[PDB]
Amino acid sequence: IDYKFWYTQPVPKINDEFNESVNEPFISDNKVEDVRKDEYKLPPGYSWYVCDVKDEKDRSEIYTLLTDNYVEDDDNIFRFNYSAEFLLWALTSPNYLKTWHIGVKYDASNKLIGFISAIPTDICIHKRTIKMAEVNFLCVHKTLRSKRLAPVLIKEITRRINLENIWQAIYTAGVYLPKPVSDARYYHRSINVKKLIEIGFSSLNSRLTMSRAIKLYRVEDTLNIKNMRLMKKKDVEGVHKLLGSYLEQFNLYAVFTKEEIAHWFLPIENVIYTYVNEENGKIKDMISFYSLPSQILGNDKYSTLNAAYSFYNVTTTATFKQLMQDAILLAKRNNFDVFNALEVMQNKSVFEDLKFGEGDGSLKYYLYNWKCASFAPAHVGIVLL
Ligand SMILES: CCCCCCCCCCCCCC(=O)CSCCNC(=O)CCNC(=O)[C@H](O)C(C)(C)COP(=O)(O)OP(=O)(O)OC[C@H]1O[C@@H](n2cnc3c(N)ncnc32)[C@H](O)[C@@H]1OP(=O)(O)O
Ligand SMILES: Cc1cc(F)ccc1-c1ccc2[nH]nc(CN(C)C)c2c1
Ligand SMILES: CCOC(=O)c1c(C)nc2ccccc2c1C
Ligand SMILES: [Cl-]
Ligand SMILES: [Mg+2]
């Protein structure tokens, strides 16, 4: 459309296409010393608030704000319902800064009505490793929409990030913005198909009756990789090598340290599920998925859809199809209703045979202050929360 805000920022124009050899900032030679030391102005009666995600009550305020005002699907059937414990995990990874968890309070109610967050990460884009901020959980209260508050939150966080001598960022959104480096459709594999029909999501007909739909999505309760088990602290070094080598093939991926592997994969109930196959004290295969429920808006019977989201999956002893079939099984054993995956990495190759259905949209991958050729989602090797 016009992108009056986005076009002031070091991002590509809607028309911009770069050749494969281009891989650099839009604006280089930035100076920490020149970064504005003042907070961006909020409109009258609003104030910046530094959230302490480790404090249960500050964390619960962020939780409420998102439970009520965060992303909905295009038909407003669903709203993401990230749990408080999930938010603690997503925001307190290694070297996180408390000052990159930025809230906005309405002074007179003392209530949180705005939020944005970033955590630091090393990102490899087209074989160049860049220290970046990963931005996530940008949210304005439904009652305050289209008032140009989002660019204030975006400018304030960019300012705080630049204070740490960091000048690039990664982010994802379902909305089209200038301009994606990659665009990945999502797919869904029904697990609790009766529930899915009942809330309006899945479709039946003459050929596909209720009983036939249930038969179609039945899984055998036996693993292809018999020894696949929950990840444990002893597996951190093994996972780090398995995953770190795997990821090198891609055009876009995080370069995880050991401390990151421990944070991002060690299992937490209702948050992150990681499974490993150990042979001879070596980790040869791994499955992971995170738990992201959606709230079901205005269904009499159900209020929550429990959804497992494919995270990182690597196999060296089975086919990728057998690995993902095990991942679906492990999601089913843990009470999930549906398993969601993007057409990143090798994922697309299994979607047909494993009975995934194509969804109604896509997740776009973005870089801030970085010029490079865009690429097909098969070359994307990072999954953001
Ligand atoms: C070097 C470090 C750099 C760090 C920074 C990196 C950049 C990080 C960027 C952030 C990454 C976040 C990633 C992330 O969190 C994951 S994507 C999820 C974003 N959150 C939601 O969708 C929750 C529901 N929606 C809302 O709360 C509001 O609709 C929000 C706050 C989204 C927009 O509030 P609003 O009341 O609806 O709108 P105004 O205040 O009037 O503002 C309109 C301006 O906002 C642009 N807009 C709309 N949605 C956007 C989105 N998802 N990203 C970026 N920009 C977005 C829009 O194009 C327009 O600019 P334009 O006029 O140019 O078109
Ligand atoms: C529905 C879905 C399925 C799937 F397998 C992977 C991703 C999505 C999805 C679609 C739109 C979204 N907007 N914001 C988010 C949250 N973040 C990832 C930032 C988001 C996620
Ligand atoms: C069958 C379940 O998967 C989905 O269709 C789904 C859900 C549950 N929540 C969402 C929340 C926000 C944006 C999109 C969403 C989509 C696409
Ligand atoms: Cl400004
Ligand atoms: Mg606004």
From TrEMBL:
<dbReference type="InterPro" id="IPR000903">
    <property type="entry name" value="NMT"/>
</dbReference>
<feature type="binding site">
    <location>
        <position position="138"/>
    </location>
    <ligand>
        <name>tetradecanoyl-CoA</name>
    </ligand>
</feature>
<keyword id="KW-0808">Transferase</keyword>
<feature type="binding site">
    <location>
        <position position="5"/>
    </location>
    <ligand>
        <name>tetradecanoyl-CoA</name>
    </ligand>
</feature>
<feature type="binding site">
    <location>
        <position position="137"/>
    </location>
    <ligand>
        <name>tetradecanoyl-CoA</name>
    </ligand>
</feature>
<dbReference type="InterPro" id="IPR022677">
    <property type="entry name" value="NMT_C"/>
</dbReference>
<dbReference type="GO" id="GO:0046872">
    <property type="term" value="F:metal ion binding"/>
</dbReference>
<feature type="binding site">
    <location>
        <position position="148"/>
    </location>
    <ligand>
        <name>tetradecanoyl-CoA</name>
    </ligand>
</feature>
<feature type="binding site">
    <location>
        <position position="3"/>
    </location>
    <ligand>
        <name>tetradecanoyl-CoA</name>
    </ligand>
</feature>
<feature type="domain" description="Glycylpeptide N-tetradecanoyltransferase C-terminal">
    <location>
        <begin position="198"/>
        <end position="374"/>
    </location>
</feature>
<feature type="binding site">
    <location>
        <position position="6"/>
    </location>
    <ligand>
        <name>tetradecanoyl-CoA</name>
    </ligand>
</feature>
<feature type="domain" description="Glycylpeptide N-tetradecanoyltransferase N-terminal">
    <location>
        <begin position="29"/>
        <end position="182"/>
    </location>
</feature>
<dbReference type="Pfam" id="PF01233">
    <property type="entry name" value="NMT"/>
</dbReference>
<dbReference type="GO" id="GO:0005737">
    <property type="term" value="C:cytoplasm"/>
</dbReference>
<dbReference type="InterPro" id="IPR022676">
    <property type="entry name" value="NMT_N"/>
</dbReference>
<comment type="similarity">
    <text>Belongs to the NMT family.</text>
</comment>
<feature type="binding site">
    <location>
        <position position="150"/>
    </location>
    <ligand>
        <name>tetradecanoyl-CoA</name>
    </ligand>
</feature>
<comment type="function">
    <text>Adds a myristoyl group to the N-terminal glycine residue of certain cellular proteins. Myristoylates adenylate kinase AK2. During the asexual blood stage, may myristoylate proteins such as ARO, CDPK1 and GAP45. Probably by mediating protein myristoylation, plays a role in the assembly of the inner membrane complex during the early stages of schizogony and in the formation of rhoptries in the late stages and thus merozoite egress.</text>
</comment>
<feature type="binding site">
    <location>
        <position position="300"/>
    </location>
    <ligand>
        <name>Mg(2+) 2</name>
    </ligand>
</feature>
<comment type="subunit">
    <text>Heterodimer composed of NMT and AK2; AK2 myristoylation stabilizes the complex.</text>
</comment>
<feature type="binding site">
    <location>
        <position position="146"/>
    </location>
    <ligand>
        <name>tetradecanoyl-CoA</name>
    </ligand>
</feature>
<keyword id="KW-0479">Metal-binding</keyword>
<feature type="binding site">
    <location>
        <position position="140"/>
    </location>
    <ligand>
        <name>tetradecanoyl-CoA</name>
    </ligand>
</feature>
<keyword id="KW-0012">Acyltransferase</keyword>
<feature type="binding site">
    <location>
        <position position="70"/>
    </location>
    <ligand>
        <name>tetradecanoyl-CoA</name>
    </ligand>
</feature>
<feature type="binding site">
    <location>
        <position position="149"/>
    </location>
    <ligand>
        <name>tetradecanoyl-CoA</name>
    </ligand>
</feature>
<dbReference type="Pfam" id="PF02799">
    <property type="entry name" value="NMT_C"/>
</dbReference>
<dbReference type="InterPro" id="IPR022678">
    <property type="entry name" value="NMT_CS"/>
</dbReference>
<dbReference type="InterPro" id="IPR016181">
    <property type="entry name" value="Acyl_CoA_acyltransferase"/>
</dbReference>
<feature type="binding site">
    <location>
        <position position="144"/>
    </location>
    <ligand>
        <name>Mg(2+) 1</name>
    </ligand>
</feature>
<dbReference type="GO" id="GO:0004379">
    <property type="term" value="F:glycylpeptide N-tetradecanoyltransferase activity"/>
</dbReference>
<protein>
    <recommendedName>
        <fullName>Glycylpeptide N-tetradecanoyltransferase</fullName>
        <ecNumber>2.3.1.97</ecNumber>
    </recommendedName>
</protein>
